[PDB]
Design a protein around this nucleic acid. Structure first.
Lengths: 67, 170, 204, 174, 108
RNA sequence: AACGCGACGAUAACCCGCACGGUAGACGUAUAAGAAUAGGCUCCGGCCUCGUAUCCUAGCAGGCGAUUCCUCCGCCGG
């Protein structure tokens, strides 16, 4: 990136290097996307997760008891 | 009337306070699942039927899902949840019947001898049980189609650790 | 973020003295029970000798001290050096003030009730967050040891024993971390994958 | 002193029969608002010449905005302050994106290292250093040096002040 | 069995009265709501009902529980503390005692 | 320390009458490495600003009977 580059020149390097695609792969963004999706959960979709983690947990325990 | 005014009790002046219809919040719609916060059915999730006058709300359980009958409740004492159920097939004529104000409102030997005794719990009436069944018949059949709503409505709302209601989206 | 706990245990290592004392005294008055462990590992800013003059200065301005309750008594252990700090920050001549100190409970080392419990930290009083890197600091254990605390080698040997018990705790927690992660991978093949995407679309 | 702005203040003597069309003096004044910019203008003008506010009028007050506030440049500020000992002259260098930002930098810097307030401090000349090697100053010199790249060790992370208790000891590697 | 709770209130602590250095006014009390830390979060809890529940060591209605009711009037400070007005002022020895903040009246 | 403390030895019962069921503050009152902050952890793949996490969390304040599961919890003994 050239020093002091104006907005057009940084945009040229932005699209060429693909900063947005690399940021989505970055683990910092996945934690952010997990956080935003968690915060948008309504009360009825909170009742799914209580029911739904229970179903997932049951296959975890016979696997855990196996080993 | 009959009597001359026997004292100097002045009549009140004509007050300028006309009664105007109550405008409910946008989140209250027919079919919205509601969370009761006060009363004997606190914490219970219920389904709204009709918005009545002066902040009163007509709400059913339905009875076979959680146990809440046809009842009234105040708007400020309830929380509206983003899930909305369908009321296709529900009798609007029967709902308009149970929305009337008269519905939920209504010296001898036996009078003297029952002084101090605790009154016996009178049971449910035939019409109250029959109107309940007529309203709910198309209601829980609607509830079975949407997945996990039956266990949702039979459950009770509560707050866990870290549950901050100013951040919870309902 | 303003959570109410039953009792909160504060690890004392790497914490500055008066900033921990100011935060603790506000929670005691608010109604929080406080337990402080490792009072010998607390830190006081500045060089060691600066701590020595203010120890000599406190004994200077008091004629005929009580040997048992005060005077050089307060400096003869690290637990009660901290108790002297919290007491000057609390209305101790009031019954609300006395009640706030009964919520406090300070120790040197980690007693057996509190080594199996979780020890939190206070970010606003941590030495490495508040002090400049080149600034020099002293430990309250070596302040009390040069005043007359007698059990510095005692609390050391009990602490090196506690590390050894803690080493066996991780080695048990290592094996649980293997088995839990393995069971997560093992049951994911039969986790009914209509529902695995449902949890991923909700954040779990 | 605050978010100062630049002000062009032009004024002249109230005309008489003897001197119609007076001389129209102009001054550039840094001030937080216009009523301070006009006050500084009459303060200086009575200092050099005999004109005063009572016998004078102000013909214009205009804001001089930055031509390129998105470009970073070096500023040389000539200066004059009155201490207890007397008045002295010095010259500071600042690196900001605007002249009012450099004067903001000066006023905090001069009050810190020399304890000089707004009344004592007189602006002499603030001018953009157009070309390198006209920078006469060491801490600016290392910044204008070739391929600047420094680490950020021991950065204290933002922990919210209302989270009094923390479960994990924070890390200072971010 | 459910093995779940029944709490429908936010937890709070009675901090003090409205006061200066030395002039305390008992008719308004200060409450620290759990989870609120800015003035923005305190704006949610305004005009919510607030109950103070205690025990009295005598049964008057078959119960030793007595309640004092109130409401959250305005935010206090920048840290989420709120001002509460009750029917009667809270005692004094309840400084640092539990307070139940209800979720009614609701506008959600 | 006679108004601090630890270990140990030896150590108070049936009958008759009659008065009542605190605590500065429970409501999921769940969560043990150590050590450093010019570093560290690990499953050795990788990972650490973020405890904004993990566990637990449905039913008359939580019933009855099933279908169905050998998961979770509790009491006594070794």
């Amino acid at each position: 990136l050239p020093r002091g580059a104006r907005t057009g020149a940084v945009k040229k390097a932005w699209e060429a290097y693909g900063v947005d695609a690399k940021w989505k792969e970055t683990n910092w963004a996945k934690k952010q996307l997990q956080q935003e999706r968690r915060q948008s959960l309504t009360d009825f979709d909170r009742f799914k997760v209580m029911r739904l983690k229970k179903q997932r947990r049951f296959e975890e325990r016979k696997a855990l008891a196996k080993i | 009337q009959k009597w001359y005014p026997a004292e100097d009790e002045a009549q009140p002046k004509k007050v300028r306070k006309a009664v105007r219809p109550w405008t409910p919040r946008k989140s209250l719609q027919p079919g919205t699942v509601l969370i009761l916060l006060a009363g004997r059915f606190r914490g219970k999730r219920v389904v709204l039927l009709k918005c009545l006058d002066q902040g009163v709300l007509l709400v059913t359980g339905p009875f076979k899902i959680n146990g809440v009958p046809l009842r009234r409740v105040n708007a400020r004492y309830v929380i509206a949840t983003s899930v909305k159920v369908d009321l296709t097939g529900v009798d609007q004529a029967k709902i308009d019947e149970v929305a009337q104000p008269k519905y939920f409102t209504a010296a001898s030997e036996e009078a003297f001898f029952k002084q101090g005794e605790k009154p016996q719990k009178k049971p449910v009436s035939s019409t109250r049980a029959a109107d309940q069944k007529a309203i709910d018949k198309a209601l829980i059949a609607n509830i079975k189609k949407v997945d996990m709503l039956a266990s949702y409505l039979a459950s009770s709302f509560s707050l866990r650790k870290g549950d901050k209601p100013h951040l919870m989206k309902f | 973020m303003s959570s109410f706990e039953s009792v909160v245990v504060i690890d004392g290592k790497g914490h500055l003295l008066g900033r921990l004392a100011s935060i603790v005294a506000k929670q005691l008055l608010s109604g929080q029970k406080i337990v402080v462990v490792r009072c010998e590992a607390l830190n006081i800013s500045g060089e060691f000798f600066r701590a020595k003059l203010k120890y000599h200065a406190y004994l200077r301005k008091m004629t005929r001290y009580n040997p048992t309750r005060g005077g050089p008594f307060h400096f003869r252990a690290p637990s009660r050096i901290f108790y002297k700090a919290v007491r000057g920050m609390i209305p101790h001549k009031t019954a609300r003030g006395a009640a706030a100190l009964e919520r406090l409970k300070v120790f040197e080392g980690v007693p057996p009730p509190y080594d199996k419990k979780k020890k939190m930290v206070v970010p606003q009083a941590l030495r490495v967050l508040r002090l400049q890197p080149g600034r020099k600091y002293c430990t309250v254990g070596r302040l009390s040891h040069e005043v007359g605390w007698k059990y510095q080698d005692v609390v050391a040997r009990l602490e090196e024993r506690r590390k050894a018990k803690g080493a066996a705790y991780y080695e048990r927690k290592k094996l649980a971390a293997r088995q839990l992660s393995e069971a997560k991978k093992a049951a994911a093949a039969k986790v009914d994958p209509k529902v695995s995407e449902a949890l991923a679309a909700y954040g779990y | 002193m605050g978010r100062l702005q630049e002000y062009q203040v032009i004024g002249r003597h109230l005309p008489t029969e003897a001197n119609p069309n007076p001389a129209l003096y102009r001054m550039r004044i840094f001030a937080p608002n216009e009523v301070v910019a006009k006050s500084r203008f009459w303060y200086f003008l009575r200092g050099l010449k005999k004109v005063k506010k009572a016998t004078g009028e102000i013909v214009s007050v205009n804001v001089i905005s930055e031509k390129h506030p998105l470009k970073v440049k070096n500023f040389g500020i000539w200066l004059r302050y009155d201490s207890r000992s007397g008045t002295h002259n010095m010259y500071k260098e600042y690196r900001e994106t605007s002249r009012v930002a450099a004067v903001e930098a000066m006023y905090a810097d001069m009050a810190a290292r020399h304890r000089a307030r707004f009344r004592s401090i007189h602006i002499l000349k603030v001018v953009e250093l157009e070309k390198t090697e006209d920078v006469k100053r060491p801490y600016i010199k290392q910044l204008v040096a070739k391929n600047l790249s420094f680490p950020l060790p021991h950065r204290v992370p933002k922990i919210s002040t209302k989270k009094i208790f923390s479960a994990k000891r924070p890390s200072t590697f971010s | 069995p459910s093995e779940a709770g029944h709490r429908l209130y936010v937890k709070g602590r009675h901090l003090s009265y409205q006061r200066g250095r030395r002039n305390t006014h008992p008719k308004t009390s200060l409450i620290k709501i759990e989870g609120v830390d800015d003035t923005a979060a305190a704006n949610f809890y305004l005009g919510k009902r607030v109950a103070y529940v205690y025990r009295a060591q005598k049964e008057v209605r078959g119960t030793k529980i007595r309640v004092i009711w109130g409401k959250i009037t305005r935010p206090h400070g920048n840290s989420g503390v709120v001002r509460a007005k009750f029917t009667h002022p809270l005692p004094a020895r309840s400084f640092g005692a539990s307070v139940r903040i209800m979720l009614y009246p609701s506008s959600i």
